[PDB]
Design a protein around this ligand. Structure first.
Ligand code: SAH
Ligand code: SAH
Lengths: 393, 393
């Protein structure tokens, strides 16, 4: 309410006067209450004007990024607009007008009428760091695809986008007949930033803590030879390392990391001593599962990138390798009906490449097509991210 | 400070509890305080999340609008996603996934597992109305232009765009020979939407209530043909209708509604009997004012669309048509320095069409260059909006 929002501000202001910085918990509670109060107070004209302001504050940030303006405003203190314009090589009037938008929305501050300064909200834009790369990748790569969606569905019909061909992304790029991978292969720099981005995306999901792997240990004692955990598309093997650190009774040397050859060779050359103790295999999980009869096959944050038919193809190759008692674990969001905001947004972004976040019933459909039955679903603390446990039907 | 902000929230809360209802001014003030709270507590990750939520929500709204979903969701009650999908002729799965984005933020409500309902936030999208038209103008006609700004300034240099030709909008449209008004005026559905949007946001752009016209009604008696008010670029004459309703002794038949040929022809097709009884007239105000000796020439929300020199040239044509007792009235946004929140947003948008928001002093310098003397400036008490009353120097 208005009063409880006031109470959280009074508390913040008092605690700062006491040299006690804000808790992350305290911060999320304050911004959540603000949003609640805004949703209660704002009328539709306020909602829509706030949305339009969001477009122009992002466009202003993008333009000042392009002009290298945030780098020229010093981390502390200020710079005169005239001096900023000289260093940029442009007209002080237009540079000032763009800065004034960000002054009016609290991103920058003016010291007098003559000078401009960073705030905490703009310092991440003044140099190299993951937030600035994440920001630029969302803006440059996704906003035009979002704007192209009405035209996309005009062309293809109001139908769920499911293939690796004719994606919204590739359509936006002008090459719907190519895969996003064929398109990105012609764009070195953008391929570099797409690799930065989705490695940062996997940083946000827990590797362990919500699923008990210890049932592997008695199987590992009964059999000295059976492969234990096969990580299909496991990137640099960090999930396997975390699992085996968590349960030392699972020898990483009896686990298998599968990925693309370029990923495996850099694991062979730079990864830790434990991940190099594992069996490392270049594979194409669209075509093959080479390890036969392992206790566990794990597919983590992969199926979300693909439509139902491509997922069933991936799963059927694994099922063919499974022994009757093997488990296939899918680590992904089991999105709710209706979904919470973060998975709902991620699902919208996945629609541009042919993927989606699946409900429990949708996961049951594709696992059954592949000859599997879901026997448990174990949820993490994060946004319905879960371990789906499957056995042969 | 946080403490003065909390204080304002608390006193707002008390009046509501105490029975007194929120006046329009108090609503605008509370929204302003909530924005100040946002600027004071948001961190970069909150800004990134808000940018992403705004862009995704806008794209979901635009798609569901384009698909006629909001039209098919009943005004109250709920409708099954399957019925909705059948009625719009689309796949229930992709329609649900998009609705789920709006459900997650509270724009739509989901009932049970399979029904969806409007809220007050989405009913504006269900049919044609001024607020929806304002939002569509921003989103369809300007958001793609924001994305062209870096290329535009790489093409023409980092300098304030002040020309009526080669605007960023015309650059994006591919029509270097045309002003923005001409571009819009050549497409019937874009024109129709623009006309409807001119009644929106009366909270920023009031049509009556800040300037007294009753002095015109005596002058009406002094002649039978003398034009009383000439509405230069008056769109569909909404402002003339509002003036003539407020002062019934100004007959609309003695008023002239002027606009581009494509706009004025559409006004003929969609206008009611009242405006069709005025004198409609195609003009080009960059080159002419063809009505000589009218009592009042009104120039409402025109000068904001053009740069200084162009505004002087437009005003000069009108000055040349004025009789000695004529008045030239400029109705427009008048903001401070730096601009307030809403004019700051519009100033950034207007840079794409060669215009800007202005202070009172900036307007005084332009009227002086045009040979006008300002005899009064009558501000709205609810908006940064004024009537600037002028006569020949
Ligand atoms: N056809 C293919 N065969 C094997 N691996 C592939 C593949 N296509 C993509 N990959 C790999 O699959 C991974 C998807 S990102 C998922 C990584 C990891 N499972 C996690 O915890 O998030 C990438 O590392 C990529 O290199
Ligand atoms: N060269 C020109 N000659 C006449 N009208 C023009 C014009 N260029 C733009 N316009 C008109 O200027 C108007 C700007 S929008 C302002 C409309 C109205 N006076 C109001 O305040 O509600 C539009 O209707 C547009 O069609």
């Amino acid at each position: 309410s208005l009063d409880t929002l006031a109470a959280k501000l009074i508390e913040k202001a008092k605690d700062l006067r006491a040299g006690n910085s804000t808790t992350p918990q305290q911060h999320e509670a304050l911004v959540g209450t603000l949003k609640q109060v805004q949703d209660a107070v704002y009328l539709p004209r306020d909602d829509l004007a706030a949305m339009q302001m969001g477009f122009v504050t992002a466009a202003a940030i993008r333009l000042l990024l392009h002009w290298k303006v945030f780098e020229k405003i010093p981390d502390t203190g200020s710079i005169r607009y005239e001096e900023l314009a000289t260093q940029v090589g442009g007209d002080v009037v237009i540079i000032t007008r763009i800065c004034w938008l960000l002054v009016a929305t609290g991103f920058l501050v003016q010291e007098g009428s003559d000078r401009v300064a960073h705030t905490a909200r703009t310092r991440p834009f003044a140099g190299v760091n993951p937030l600035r790369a994440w920001w630029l990748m969302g803006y440059d790569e996704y906003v035009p695809v979002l704007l192209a969606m009405p035209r996309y569905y005009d062309t293809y019909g109001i139908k769920e986008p499911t293939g690796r061909l004719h994606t919204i992304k590739a359509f936006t790029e002008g090459s719907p007949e190519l895969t996003v991978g064929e398109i990105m292969s012609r764009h070195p720099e953008r391929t570099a930033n797409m690799l930065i981005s989705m490695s940062a995306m996997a940083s946000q999901y827990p590797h362990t803590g919500f699923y008990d792997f210890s049932w592997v240990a008695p199987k590992a004692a009964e059999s000295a030879t059976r492969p234990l955990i096969v990580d299909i598309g496991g990137a640099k093997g960090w999930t396997l390392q975390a699992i085996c650190k968590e349960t030392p009774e699972i020898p990483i040397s009896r686990c298998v990391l599968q990925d693309l050859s370029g990923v495996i060779q850099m694991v062979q050359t730079v990864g830790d001593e434990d991940i190099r103790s594992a069996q490392l295999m270049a594979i194409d999980f669209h075509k093959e599962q080479p390890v036969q009869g392992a206790l566990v096959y794990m597919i983590r944050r992969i199926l979300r990138d693909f439509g139902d038919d491509e997922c069933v193809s991936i799963l059927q190759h694994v099922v063919a390798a499974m022994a009757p008692d093997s488990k296939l674990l899918i680590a992904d969001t089991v999105t709710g009906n209706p979904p919470s905001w973060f998975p709902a947004m991620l699902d919208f972004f996945l629609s541009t490449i042919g993927g989606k976040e699946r409900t429990e019933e949708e996961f049951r459909k594709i696992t059954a097509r592949a000859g599997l039955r879901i026997t448990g679903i174990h949820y993490s603390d994060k946004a319905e991210f879960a371990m789906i446990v499957c056995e042969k039907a």
